[PDB]
Design a protein around this ligand. Sequence first.
Ligand SMILES: [Cl-]
Ligand SMILES: [Cl-]
Ligand SMILES: [Cl-]
Ligand SMILES: [Cl-]
Ligand SMILES: [Cl-]
Ligand SMILES: [Cl-]
Ligand SMILES: [Cl-]
Ligand code: NA
Ligand code: NA
Ligand code: NA
Ligand code: NA
Ligand code: NA
Ligand code: NA
Ligand code: NA
Lengths: 307, 325
Amino acid sequence: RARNVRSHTGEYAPDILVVGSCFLDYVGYVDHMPQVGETMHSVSFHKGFGGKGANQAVAAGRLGAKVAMVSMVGTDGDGSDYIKELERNGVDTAYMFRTGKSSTGLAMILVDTKSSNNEIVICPNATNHFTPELLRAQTNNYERILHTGLKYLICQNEIPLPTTLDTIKEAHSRGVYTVFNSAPAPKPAEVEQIKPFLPYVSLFCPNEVEATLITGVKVTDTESAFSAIKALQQLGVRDVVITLGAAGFVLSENGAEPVHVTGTTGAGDCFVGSMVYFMSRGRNLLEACKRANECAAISVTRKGTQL
Amino acid sequence: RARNVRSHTGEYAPDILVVGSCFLDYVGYVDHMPQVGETMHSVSFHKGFGGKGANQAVAAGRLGAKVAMVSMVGTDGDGSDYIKELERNGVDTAYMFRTGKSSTGLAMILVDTKSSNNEIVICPNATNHFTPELLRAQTNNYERILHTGLKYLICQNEIPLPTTLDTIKEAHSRGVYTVFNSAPAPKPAEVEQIKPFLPYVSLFCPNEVEATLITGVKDTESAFSAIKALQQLGVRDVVITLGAAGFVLSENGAEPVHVTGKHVKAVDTTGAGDCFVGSMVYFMSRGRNLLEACKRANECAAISVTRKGTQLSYPHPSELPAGVM
Ligand SMILES: [Cl-]
Ligand SMILES: [Cl-]
Ligand SMILES: [Cl-]
Ligand SMILES: [Cl-]
Ligand SMILES: [Cl-]
Ligand SMILES: [Cl-]
Ligand SMILES: [Cl-]
Ligand code: NA
Ligand code: NA
Ligand code: NA
Ligand code: NA
Ligand code: NA
Ligand code: NA
Ligand code: NA
């Protein structure tokens, strides 16, 4: 077993649960994009650990969080490699599920540094079979992962939507503080499914496009972001944070006067996971988001020295 | 340790040594080929075991060969998965080398569902470090992998060329029968390096393109003259594969023979050449002469083209019609 094991007494039960995606990033650096029928060689290769769920868990884990990842990977060696990497970055893996019927999720990424263009083919693989029915079957209808000590759930939109939404609803019903980063951007039929679950979301943390798709408010600046915050509170979200990329973020804590704070692969994931870590340490939303925003800049720098 | 362990008595020393590539095949099926700047999802994904070296070893292993793979993979999960897969296909992995400084070699392969065309980016990764100097350092200057009873070496052209050429020379000098399948096709600088080593090649088994690049000779009758060119360059036995026109061969300079392709309905020919080479050597290790071995290899390759899956399409004995084994 690569995975952690829970105790009978629950003495290592997490403060933060992340229910989401784990994808390996297979990055081939090429002198040009392949044309149809072409066999070529890479000039360099790099294997990375991604998926927004793993990214957000690892962000928290690297700051010391008592975080656990709930996801699905393969029984393949790639799955084993992810499980170990999560442990080495402070993420408990006891509730990582493994399937022999699918490969671990991955993205195949081609990069032309010359032209600095990309091509990306996302292969969620095992992820696609991470359904609410399977989750419930493996967790005694969520009882195994939503223990009484649990303070935070983080979800994204990179696993089957019903799994994300049903988990949010169940955690919220137990008094868990639920955090939903709706990334990647929801499609029209996903927006429709999401809206009735928004009353079970303690904290909705979209970027501008995501806020635009959910609320129908065109978010391009602080003013429109503040309007989106209102639209989201009306849909029943308690706390809102809308990230504005490099231009900072806006937030409202439980309907108080919104606040604007002034200002890259996976920087957003670093922000979200860091934010929850700080909240788990007792910071309020604003304090957590300022600290998260700084962690996110430090992450970009640290990342830049490695690649 | 996933890898096999040798005994001090040489109890399990192989009859056939394959010194070549192991690549994981990451196969993404897509609605269309990604355009520049496109992010898409696959329709489905398939993980396969490839590399011409492993393919050829596995072809032989599946027929029951006492075959061992010499290659380089990662300490990663892909590495461990290949090492187990090889054992499950009857290939000894005692001389599989592992590096923690590189990932396992892989091919990223996109397959268009409609047009059935491919785009392929090869990432040799650990394979790039599979050098003569490293091979020597890990085998006591080849002593550990070239024991007396070793009968056959198989090489391709999917590792560093010096590793291939130096191994062929050392094996040949110990009286091992050396098989060299120059695939993928050698590049111009590779052709110049290879030609001086052809006297150390017992059996050269190129396709048409590859024979052309090596010989200077550009169908059956030109293939026959390419054979003569290769014998002159020092190659003892020659087999040139012709895709659909079967193949031509000459044993030790005897009158060439042409053998017709088995006319089957080819659904997926991926790895079929590798099937032919590995199967050929297997049959020679069981005592068949070159023509007999290639006829049986031909039957095996024919069976492989009737289904998808590359190594998975390679037959096991129980699956074969009578008169192949
Ligand atoms: Cl495990
Ligand atoms: Cl990484
Ligand atoms: Cl899969
Ligand atoms: Cl091992
Ligand atoms: Cl396979
Ligand atoms: Cl590498
Ligand atoms: Cl099989
Ligand atoms: Na820690
Ligand atoms: Na931790
Ligand atoms: Na499991
Ligand atoms: Na399944
Ligand atoms: Na065997
Ligand atoms: Na070399
Ligand atoms: Na086939």
